[PDB]
Amino acid sequence: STSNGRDSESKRLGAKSADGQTVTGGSILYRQRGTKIYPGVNVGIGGDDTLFAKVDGVVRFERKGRDKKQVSVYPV
Amino acid sequence: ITKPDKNKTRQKRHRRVRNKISGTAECPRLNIFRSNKNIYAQVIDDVAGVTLASASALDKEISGGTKTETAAAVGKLVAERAAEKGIKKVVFDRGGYLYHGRVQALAEAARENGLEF
Amino acid sequence: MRVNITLECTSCKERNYLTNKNKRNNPDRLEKQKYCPRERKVTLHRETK
Amino acid sequence: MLVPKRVKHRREFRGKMRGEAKGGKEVAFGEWGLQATESHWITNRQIEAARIAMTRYMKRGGKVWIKIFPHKSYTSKAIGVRMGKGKGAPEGWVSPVKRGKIMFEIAGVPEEVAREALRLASHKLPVKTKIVKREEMGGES
Amino acid sequence: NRLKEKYIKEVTPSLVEKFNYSSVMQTPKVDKIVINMGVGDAVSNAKNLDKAVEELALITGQKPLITKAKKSIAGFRLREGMPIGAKVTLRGERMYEFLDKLVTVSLPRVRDFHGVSKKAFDGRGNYTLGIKEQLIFPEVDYDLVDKVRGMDIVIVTTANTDEESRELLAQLGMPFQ
RNA sequence: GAUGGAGGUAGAGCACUGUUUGGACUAGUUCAGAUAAACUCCGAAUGCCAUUCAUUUAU
RNA sequence: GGCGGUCGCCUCCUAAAAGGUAACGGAGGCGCCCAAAGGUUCCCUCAGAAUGGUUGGAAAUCAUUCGAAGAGUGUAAAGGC
RNA sequence: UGUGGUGGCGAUAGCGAGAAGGAUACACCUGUUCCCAUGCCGAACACAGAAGUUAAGCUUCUUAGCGCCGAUUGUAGUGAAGGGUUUCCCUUUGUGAGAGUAGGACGUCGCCACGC
Ligand SMILES: [Zn+2]
C-alpha cells in the first residue's frame, strides 16, 4: 500500500568520443540537456543539444573563457 | 536623470552583430565608425588581427559637400584602395547602426566601385 | 476541438499534406501556398470539405 | 520537546555517523562546556530532561545554551505487521552527535554549581562526556 | 519662447553665482513634465478612461497614452492588461506653455492658498504637484464635467541637491508657501 | 608506465534553497554558532574513454 | 493465498564523481496545447526596495535612485538561457 | 610621443574613493526644411549643423576599503597491504583537499589613422 513506484528509462547521456581520438565526419561527441558544453571549431548542435563533428579530425575538449567548455575538431 | 552615452548602447548591439559576421583574408571585414562630424572605414582580417586598407571622412581629401555626400566619397575611396590590394569579396559590419542613412551611402558607393558583398 | 486534417491541391487535386487545427479557433478552412510535387511548383492548397 | 517547523520531506535515510564532529568543538558563549566522547543519537526527550535538571540546580539563574538541535525524523511500523509495504509513519525527532561535540554551555555561576549541574545533566544522556572550560586564545576575558 | 529669455536673462546669472558654477553647463534645467491620471474604474464602467482622456487632451494638444494593469490583483478585480489610466509627456515648448498656464492662470483658481508643500521633492531634485479636480483650467468647461477627479503632475529636472531645484523652481513661478 | 580528457561521490562549506541557537539593533540590518538524501562558492583517492607512445606477455 | 493497490510513457533521489543497476523503496507529471505560442529581420531588458504624488488604501497607474538575475521561459522536475 | 578606431588574452583586466585635461580627434550642445521616427512626446532613433563648454561621458594619473589570482606545511578523505569488537576503531605504504594563511595585483600583447 504505497503510491510511489515508477521511473523513466535511462537515456545514456555523456561523452561519446574522447580527447585526442580521430573521428570521421558526422560522429556524435556529446549528448546533453541544454548546453553544458558548447560547440567549437567544426562542430554542430542538434535539435536536442547533441554535438557532432562536421569534418574528420582530432577531438579536443577546451575551456571557453572563465566558466565554460568547448569541443573542437581539427583536421590533420 | 542620467542620459547614457550612445557609444555604449551601440557597442551592446555591435557585439551581437559580430556573433555572425567575421573576417578572414579571403573575405575581409568592412567595418564602419560614425562620429558626430565624420565617418571612417577599415578593411579588417581577423585571424591575423590586422587592417588591409582604409579611408576616412574629412581627414585626407574628400570635400565638396557637407551633407550625407561626405560618406559616398569615403565608400568610393575604400573601394578603389582595396581593389589596389587585390580585394573584392568583403563582408559588411554595420557597427551597431541601422543600414539606413549615411552608412547606406558608404555601403552603396562600395558596391559600385569594386567590392562584392 | 483539435482535429487532424488534409490539405488538397487546387489545380491537380492531390491531397499532399496532413496537419492540425482547432476548429472553434479557426472556423473556416485553412489556405496555404505549398510545394505541389506533381507539378513541381508552389500552388494554393486548400482543406478538404 | 523541540520540533522543526515545516519540514520539506516527511521521511529520510538514517546513517552513517562515523564519528568526528564537524562543528562546534569549542566553547563559544559560556564559561563551561559538556563535551561528548562517544557518538550516538540524541532525542527530544533526552535534551529536555537534561535541560530541566541543569536549570533546577542553579537558583539565581545564570544562563544556559543548548547547542544541539533535532533536525532528522524517525519512522517505525507496528507490532503484528509483516515486512513489505512502504516506510512506517514518523514517530520522533533526533540529532546525530559525533565525538568531540560540545552540547551545553553555562555561565554566571562559580565552578561548583556549574560542575554539579553538568554532572546531573550527563546521567540523563546515552553518551560519555567531559567537562571543559574556555582555555586560551587572544582574548578570553 | 517665454522663459528661454527668462533663463538666459535673469536666472542663469543668479544660479551661476549663488552656487559659484565654474561652467554654465552646470546650471540646472527642466527636462520633462509628465501628467498622470489614476482612473482605476475601467474595472466597473469601460466608459471612464474615455472621459479622463477627453479632459487631458482638452488640456494639451496631444492624445495621451493608456497605462494598463502590469499585473493582476484580486483586491481591485484586476487581471493583467486591464487598461487603467492615461499619461502624457511634455518636452520643449509644450512644457513652457504648460508651466505658464499653471503659474499665471490656472493654479490660483484653487482656494485656501496652501500653494505647494515642501515635503515634495524626492530628495534628489525633482518635484511633483497635486490637483484634486479638473475645473482649475481655462480649457475645461462647466457642464461637461461629471466627476470630482483631478490629475497628478511630476516635473523632472537635472539637479543634484534639492535646494537647487527649490530655487530654480520658485524662480520660474510655482507659488510655494 | 607516461600524456591528455569527460564527470560532482568521500570530505568540508554556507554563495543559493530548506531546517535552526544566541546577541545588538529598529520600521514601526548587523555580530557571531550550527545542519542536509532529493542544498553547493568548492572538490580528492580510485575507477572509465583515448594515443602511428613504451616495456613484458598471448591473445 | 485472498482483500487492498499496481500493469505503457516522462523527470528527480536511491546509484558508490563514465555508462548501466533491485525492492508492495522516497517524491511528482502524461494520454495535449498553439495559425501564433511557428520562420525570419529590426529593436528592447527583469523581480523587488526606498523617496515623493488627489481620489487610492500596505498593495492598480506616474518620476528618480540602488538592483547579475532574488524574474520569465504554454504545461512536472532536472539541466540550460 | 599623444589621441581616435578596431582586436587577442580566465576581472592579476573589475568596483568605489581622489586628482587633472581640450592641440587635432571624441563628446555634450543647437535645430527640424528635406530621408526616417514616437503604440503620447525630434526623449530615442534620422537628418541639417558648429553659437557655446570641459560640468557629465572619454583619457591619464594616485589609492589595496570590496571583489578577483593565490603558494608552502599541517590536518579530513581515500589505492594497495594487515589487525581488534566488527555499530565502529587502529597500524604500515602511496596519494591529498576544503578552510585558514605568506604573497600577487589599480592590466598585458598587436594592427590602422592623424597630429608632435
Ligand atoms: Zn496540384
Residue numbers in the entry:
A (entry chain X): 18 to 93
B (entry chain P): 2 to 118
C (entry chain 3): 1 to 49
D (entry chain N): 1 to 141
E (entry chain F): 2 to 178
What does the report in the manuscript say about this coordinate set?
Ribosomes are the ribonucleoprotein machines responsible for protein synthesis. Here, our goal was to investigate the structural conservation of the Enterococcus faecalis ribosome compared to Escherichia coli, a model organism for structure-based development of ribosome-targeting compounds. In the analysis of the E. faecalis 70S ribosome structure determined by cryo-electron microscopy (cryo-EM) to a global resolution of 2.8 Å, we find that structural differences are located predominantly in peripheral regions, while the organization of the functional centres and antibiotic binding sites remains conserved. The cryo-EM structure of E. faecalis 70S ribosome presented here revealed that the architecture of functional centres and subunit interfaces remain conserved when compared with E. coli and S. aureus.
Structure determination by cryo-EM using multi-body refinement produced molecular maps that reached 2.8 Å for the 50S subunit, 3.0 Å for the 30S body domain, and 3.2 Å for the 30S head domain by gold-standard Fourier shell correlation. These maps were used to generate models for the 30S head and body domain and the 50S subunit. In the 16S rRNA, larger structural variations are located in solvent-exposed and peripheral sections of the beak (rRNA helix h33a), the spur (h6) and the body (h7, h10 and h44). A similar pattern can be seen in the 23S rRNA, where peripheral regions show structural differences for parts of the 5S rRNA, for the functionally important L1 and L7/L12 stalks, and for 23S rRNA helices 9, 16, 18, 28, 33, 54, 58, 59, 98 and 99, among others. We observed more significant structural differences for the C-terminal domain of ribosomal protein uL15. The sequence identity for uL15 between E. faecalis and E. coli is 50%, and the rmsd between α carbons of the two protein structures is 3.4 Å. The E. faecalis structure contains a number of loop regions that are shifted with respect to their location in the E. coli structure. However, two short helical regions that are visible in the E. faecalis structure but absent in the E. coli structure are also absent in the more closely related S. aureus structure. We also found structural differences in ribosomal protein bL33. The cryo-EM map for bL33 is consistent with a zinc-binding motif, which is present in one of these genes. For bL33, the E. faecalis structure is similar to the zinc-binding paralog observed in the T. thermophilus ribosome.
